[PDB]
Amino acid sequence: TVPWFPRTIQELDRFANQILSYGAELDADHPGFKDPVYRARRKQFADIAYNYRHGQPIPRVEYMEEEKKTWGTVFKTLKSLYKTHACYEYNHIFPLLEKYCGFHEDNIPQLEDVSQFLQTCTGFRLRPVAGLLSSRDFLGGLAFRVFHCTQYIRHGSKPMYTPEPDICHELLGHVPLFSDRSFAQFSQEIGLASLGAPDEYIEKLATIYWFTVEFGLCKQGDSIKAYGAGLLSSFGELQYCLSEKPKLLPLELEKTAIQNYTVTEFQPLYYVAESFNDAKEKVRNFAATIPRPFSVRYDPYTQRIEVL
């Protein structure tokens, strides 16, 4: 058989019933495990995500001073590195995010505002996400240019550390790239490749995603820059990834897809993309090899997937 995949953008609403119900914040190892206020706060964000329905504005939340402080620390510390380490596309849009979205040390941007901004740039939109989505579900949303993103913030005890994605990672790592048409197209291609793909292929796609959207490096001029969300929101690794230490291989989906990675240490190797358009073409071809009984196409006019 073939696994269920949404056919219209509203159908993404079914994902809320298939997330991991036991958050990382319930783990004794989590920095905010013994913090009842944090736990309660996380539950509050989970409830907002859980009741969210497509088409509604994403609820605005008043962040606590403590939360603003953490955001402020992370923002200030990472910003110094962007002009020199981030890809051109990241740097070109950041000033605009600062202007229209309130990306500033004293203010955590509201997802609704950021969503509206992405929509006018590439038609990308955000949806608050409760817990951990399956790889299939997370990737599927990309087909509709929908990014599921966290609204909560990491525990304030370790501002430069997070065992999971949090709002700092989403806003400083993902968002800027989604403002670029080429990257948006590339991302969506990964999304389309997964609709109805068998589980073992979803895993290959998840691995390509990891080495591109999360930890990708790209050629720029005669230089190399970071575009991976995991690198752009990590002070340590962003500096490391462009040093002499890591091994850099050229993006080759045949191999990238089978590659193993760590999730607790810096990556021993990165794949470098020629451009986002090139990467998109590579995904397109690769998707051609996924044993799927049909072909999919997205109709931006009606926001529906067309099964051919």
194: annotated active-site residue:
no
Give binding residues for Fe cation as ranges.
169, 174, 214
Q: Give min distance, CB of 163 to Fe ion, in A.
A: 13
Which residue out of 179, 194, 233, 234 is catalytically annotated?
A: 233
CA end-to-end distance (rounded Å), the chain: 17
65: annotated active-site residue:
no
169: annotated active-site residue:
yes
β-strands 304-307, 296-299: how paired? antiparallel
Closer to Fe ion by Cβ: residue 259 or 303: 259
Positions in the binding site for Fe ion (CB under 5 A)? 165, 229
β-strands 269-273, 217-220: how paired? parallel
104: annotated active-site residue:
no
Q: Give min distance, CB of 19 to Fe ion, in A.
A: 15
Among 234, 120, 88, 106, smallest CA distance to 172 is for 234
Closer to Fe ion by Cβ: residue 159 or 165: 165
DSSP state of 293: S
Closer to Fe ion by Cβ: residue 192 or 229: 229
Among 43, 232, 74, smallest CA distance to 156 is for 74
**Tokens 């859980």, residue?**
50
Which residue out of 169, 170, 189, 234 is catalytically annotated?
A: 169
DSSP 180-208: SHHHHHHHHHHHHHHTT--HHHHHHHHHH
Which residue out of 25, 67, 170, 214 is catalytically annotated?
A: 214
Distance of CA 109 to the CA centre of its chain: 16
Which residue out of 85, 148, 155, 174 is catalytically annotated?
A: 174
Closer to Fe ion by Cβ: residue 206 or 273: 206
Q: Give min distance, CB of 201 to Fe ion, in A.
A: 21
Q: Which helix (H) or strand (E) holds 135?
A: helix 135-142
Q: Give min distance, CB of 1 to Fe ion, in A.
A: 30
Q: Which helix (H) or strand (E) holds 297?
A: strand 296-299
Q: Which residues are catalytic?
A: 169, 174, 214, 233
